[PDB]
Amino acid sequence: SASALACSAHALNLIEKRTLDHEEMKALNREVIEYFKEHVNPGFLEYRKSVTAGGDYGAVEWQAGSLNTLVDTQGQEFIDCLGGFGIFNVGHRNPVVVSAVQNQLAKQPLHSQELLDPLRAMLAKTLAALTPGKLKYSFFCNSGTESVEAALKLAKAYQSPRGKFTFIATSGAFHGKSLGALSATAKSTFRKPFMPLLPGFRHVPFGNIEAMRTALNECKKTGDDVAAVILEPIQGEGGVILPPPGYLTAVRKLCDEFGALMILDEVQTGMGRTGKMFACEHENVQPDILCLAKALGGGVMPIGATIATEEVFSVLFDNPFLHTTTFGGNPLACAAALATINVLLEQNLPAQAEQKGDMLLDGFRQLAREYPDLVQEARGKGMLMAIEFVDNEIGYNFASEMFRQRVLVAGTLNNAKTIRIEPPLTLTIEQCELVIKAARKALAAMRQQVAFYEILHLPNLNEEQRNAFIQSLKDDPSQSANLLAEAKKLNDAQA
Amino acid sequence: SASALACSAHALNLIEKRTLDHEEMKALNREVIEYFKEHVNPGFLEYRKSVTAGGDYGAVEWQAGSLNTLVDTQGQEFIDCLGGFGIFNVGHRNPVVVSAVQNQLAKQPLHSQELLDPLRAMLAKTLAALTPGKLKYSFFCNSGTESVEAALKLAKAYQSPRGKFTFIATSGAFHGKSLGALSATAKSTFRKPFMPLLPGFRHVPFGNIEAMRTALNECKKTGDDVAAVILEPIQGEGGVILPPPGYLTAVRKLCDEFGALMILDEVQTGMGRTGKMFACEHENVQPDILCLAKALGGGVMPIGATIATEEVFSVLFDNPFLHTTTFGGNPLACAAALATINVLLEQNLPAQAEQKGDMLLDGFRQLAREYPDLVQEARGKGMLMAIEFVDNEIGYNFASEMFRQRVLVAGTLNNAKTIRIEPPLTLTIEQCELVIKAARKALAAMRQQVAFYEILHLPNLNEEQRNAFIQSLKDDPSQSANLLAEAKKLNDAQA
Amino acid sequence: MLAKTLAALTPGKLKYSFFCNSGTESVEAALKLAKAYQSPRGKFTFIATSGAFHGKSLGALSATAKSTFRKPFMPLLPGFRHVPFGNIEAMRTALNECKKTGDDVAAVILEPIQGEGGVILPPPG
C-alpha cells in the first residue's frame, strides 16, 4: 500500500502514544486484524475465534496494567493466569528487572562479540552458584529451543568420540520447534510435515522407568548405545503431567549405569514455578545438562541458558567457536536475568509459589468434584497447574468464558482437552480468590450450556415438550442439572 | 563460597554504576577473567590472546562511546570496524532505536502470546512493503539461526507433499549453528563433531551455476529431487566472497526451472550493508524465502525474521501453531526493528554505505599494492569488506596491531587468513581516514616485525653484529629492507 | 582353490576373495568392506554415478541410480551421492566439496562401462 518509510513512521507514532481514544482504538484494532490476516497468519484469527465469543476474538494487547494484569487497546483489564506459558514468573514490568534493563540500556545493549562482556561472566557465576551440584559452565542463547539445541550439541560432542549417537526422549514431551529440538519434541502433528528429522531419536512413555531401562538395554544390545536422555521434570504441554515420586532419581541412576547423559529441560518448570528454583530440586537430582529460558528473562528480555558440568562442557574449550549464537549473552538479557534471580531470591517467590499454588489447586479440585460433568481432574505443582476437561469443546468454552470474565487462560500445545493455569508467582491472594470465583461462574455457565444442548437431542419426546424445557431453562435458569434430570426422566420413560 | 543472591546483588550494583575507579576496574577485570575461566569458556581467553599482545587480551566491554566507538572498563575508546559481525548497521545506542525501545518498555516488553500484539502486525506490514516482489508474510524469531530454521521448515512443509526432500547449499556458506541450520552451514570443523545431521543436504561450489545445475539434475535423475536451494547473496563468513555478476539471477531461473524454492540468507548482508537494503536488490532477484537478523535489531534488540511468499507461507494457515517460538515478535524487538527501518530510510544509510564502502576499499586496495608481502587481496561490497593475508599468523598480527591502535577488527569463521571490516554504516569520513591510516601503521609495523624475526633467526651470525643489526633496525625503521638484505649478505658469507 | 585362482587372475594387489551368490550381494560386501575400513578413519559418504546399476538389495540400491528403482523404498542408506558418469571434473568437485564440509568420501563405486545405462563408454583415461 504505502512505502516502508510511511509504515515505520506510523508505527513509531503509535509506539510513542500512551493512550488511545476510541476512534484511534477502533482504527488500530481494524489495522492489526487486517495485517494479521494479510501478513502474519489468518489461522491465528480463526483460532482465537474458537476460544472466544464475538469481538472478543479481536482483543489487541496494549500495555501491562500491574504486576499481574494486562490492558488491551480498549482499557479492559485482564488477570493473567497464562503468564506467557511460564514467562512472567516475576510479573509484568517488574520494577527491579525494568530498572536493570534501563540502566544497561543506558550503558550498552548489545556486545561487540569480541571483547569480554562482564555481565556474561557475572551471570555464569550466579547460575553456577544457583544450580545443583557440579553444574558449572553456562552457554547463553535467546530461546528455549536454542537452549535445547545447545544441550543436544554438547551431548553429541561429548558422546560421538565414545561411539554413542542415539537420543531417548519421552512421548508427550516438548523441547522446541527448531529441527534439532524438534527431533526430541514428541507431538506427531508438530513433526510429521518436517520429516526426515535427526536420525537416532527414540521415545518411551513418560514416568515409566522400566520402559526407559528397556530402551537403553536394547540400544546397548544392538550397538545403538544412547548418548543422552532428555526429559522435562514435569511435562508442561502434555497437560502438566506429574511423574511418580522417585522417577527423576531413577532416571539419574539409570543414566549413571549406562553411561548416558541426563538432559533436564526446565525451560518451563524453572525459575521458581514449581515451588522451588528448579523442579529437579524436589528430589535433589543433578543432571549433566540443564536447560533454562522463558522466566529467566524476567518477562522483559528473551534469553536462554544451557548449564553443564565441566566434564561435558569441556568439549568446547579447545575451540570456543564450535558452538555460538548471534545475540547470546547480550548485556540486556544478562541484566534482566540477574535482576530476576535477585527478585526471586529476595522475595522468596518459590515458597510463595508453593503456597498460592496449593490454594489455587485446592479451589480447582473442589470445583472439579462439584462439576464432574465437565471437569475430569485438576492437577499441578506449585504455580504450574492444569484442568483437564471431558471434551476439547468443553475446555474451549472454559477458555472463552474465562476470557469474558477478563481472566486470561490458554490451552496446551500437546493436550487439546487441557487448559493450563500458569499465573505469575506474584499473583495476590485477592486475585487468587477472584480467579477461583471466575472459574466457578465459568463452569456454571458451561453446565447450563451442555444441559441446553443435551435437552435438544433427546429423541423420545414431542416437538413442544422440549420447548417448555428450554423456556424454563432460560427465564428460570435455576432448575439446571436437576432440570436435565427431569428431561431424561421423561425421555427414558418415553423410550 | 557466596550465595546466588549475593552474586546477583553485586551484579546489579555494577549494572547501576556508570564509571569505575581504578581499583574497582582492576577488581572487575580480575573477576571477569576468573569467571570466564571457570564458568564461560577458558578457550576464549586463549583466542583473544592470539589476537592481542599482553594485557590487551583482557579488555572488558563497558559502554558505547558514540555511534561508532566502544569504551572498555579502562576508558580506552575503540573505533568499531567489527560492527558485531553485521549487527550495528545504525551504530551503537542509536537515539531513535533506543527511544522506541524505551517507549515500548514503558508500555509492555513481552507479549502474552495469546492476544493480538500490534507491533508484530505493524512490522510484518512494513517488511512486506520493504521486500522485493511477492514476499508478503513474516515469521519473527530471535536469531539468524532460528530464521534459517524457519526457512528450512517452510520449505519442508511445502515440498514434502510434493515428494522433494533434499537441500542444496554451497561450500563456504554459514547459516547458523542450530542442528537444522548447521546441516546447511558448510564448515567441516563446525559440523563433524555433531554428525549425523539432517539427511539429504548437499553442497556445491559457491558462484558456480553449472555445478548447481549438475546437482539439481543428478538429484532429479536419482529420485532425490531438491526441495530448496539456500545461499547467501555474498558469503560473509567465507571471507566476503563475491559471486560472478548474474549468479543470483541464474540461481533464481534454475530454481524456477526445477521447481525448487530459493532461500536467500541475508542475515549478514541485509539492512543496507551492501549498499542497498538487501543484497538481492543488486540484481532485482526475489527469492521464495528471505532470512533476516542481526542488523534488524538496530544493535539494541535480538530479532530474526523469515519472510516468504503467500504461496509458500500458506502451509501454516490451517495450523498456526505448526511452527512457533517462545519470544518471537515481542514488542521490544519489533519496536527496535521499526526504528531501524525508519533510520535507514530517512538517512539513506544504504547509499552512504556504498560511498564509504567504495572509499575504504580504495584505501585498502592501495595498501594492498603497497604491501604485497603481507596482503594477498582486499575485497568488499558496500560496507561488507575483507582483507585476505598471506598466512593466518600475518592476519593475526594485523588484528593485534589494529587492536593496539584502538580500531576493532576480527576474523571470519570460515576463513582463517581473512580479516573482516564491517563498521557501522554511520561511520564518519574522519573515522574512515583514521581507519585507513591505522591499517597503514599496522602493515608497517608488521613488515618491520617480519624483518625483525628474519634478522633474529639467521644462524650464521654471532651476537655482536646481531645486536648492531637490530639496534639499527630500531633506530632507523625505514632502512628495514636494506639491513635485512645486509644481514643475509653476511649470513651467506660465513656459511 | 578359487580364491587363489582369482588372486592370480586379478590385476595388481587384489588378493583376498569373499564368495556370495549374486551381483547385488557382491556389491553389498564391497560396501561393507569400504565401511569397515573407512569408518574408523572418519569417512562415511559414498559417491556413485547417474545411470549406474549395482543391484537391488537396499545397500546396493543406495548406489544404484535409477529413480524408479529407488523412490518407493526411500529412505535408503544415508550419505550416497551421484555425479555424471565419465565426467572427472564433476567427481573431483564432489570429493572436494565433501572434504570441505566434513563429509569425506569413503569410497567411489562405478562400472567401467555402464551396462543398464545403454552401454555407456567413458572417455579414454
Curated annotation (Swiss-Prot), chain C:
Q: What induces it?
A: Up-regulated under nitrogen starvation conditions. Expression is sigma-54-dependent. Up-regulated by putrescine; this gene expression regulation is controlled by at least two sigma factors: rpoS under excess nitrogen conditions and rpoN under nitrogen-starvation conditions.
Binding-site residues for pyridoxal 5'-phosphate, renumbered to this chain: 23-24
Q: How is it used?
A: Can be used in the industrial production of the value-added compound 5-aminovalerate.
Please state what is observed when this gene is inactivated.
Cells lacking this gene show a high decrease in putrescine aminotransferase activity, but are still able to grow with putrescine as the sole nitrogen source. However, a mutant lacking both patA and either puuA, puuB or puuC cannot grow with putrescine as the sole nitrogen source.
The family line of this record is: Belongs to the class-III pyridoxal-phosphate-dependent aminotransferase family. Putrescine aminotransferase subfamily.
Subunit field text: Homodimer.
Summarizing the function annotation, the protein's role is:
Catalyzes the aminotransferase reaction from putrescine to 2-oxoglutarate, leading to glutamate and 4-aminobutanal, which spontaneously cyclizes to form 1-pyrroline. This is the first step in one of two pathways for putrescine degradation, where putrescine is converted into 4-aminobutanoate (gamma-aminobutyrate or GABA) via 4-aminobutanal, which allows E.coli to grow on putrescine as the sole nitrogen source. Also functions as a cadaverine transaminase in a a L-lysine degradation pathway to succinate that proceeds via cadaverine, glutarate and L-2-hydroxyglutarate.
Protein's name in the database: Putrescine aminotransferase
Q: Which organism is it from?
A: Escherichia coli (strain K12)
Gene it is expressed from:
patA
List the range of the whole protein covered here. 128 to 252 of 459
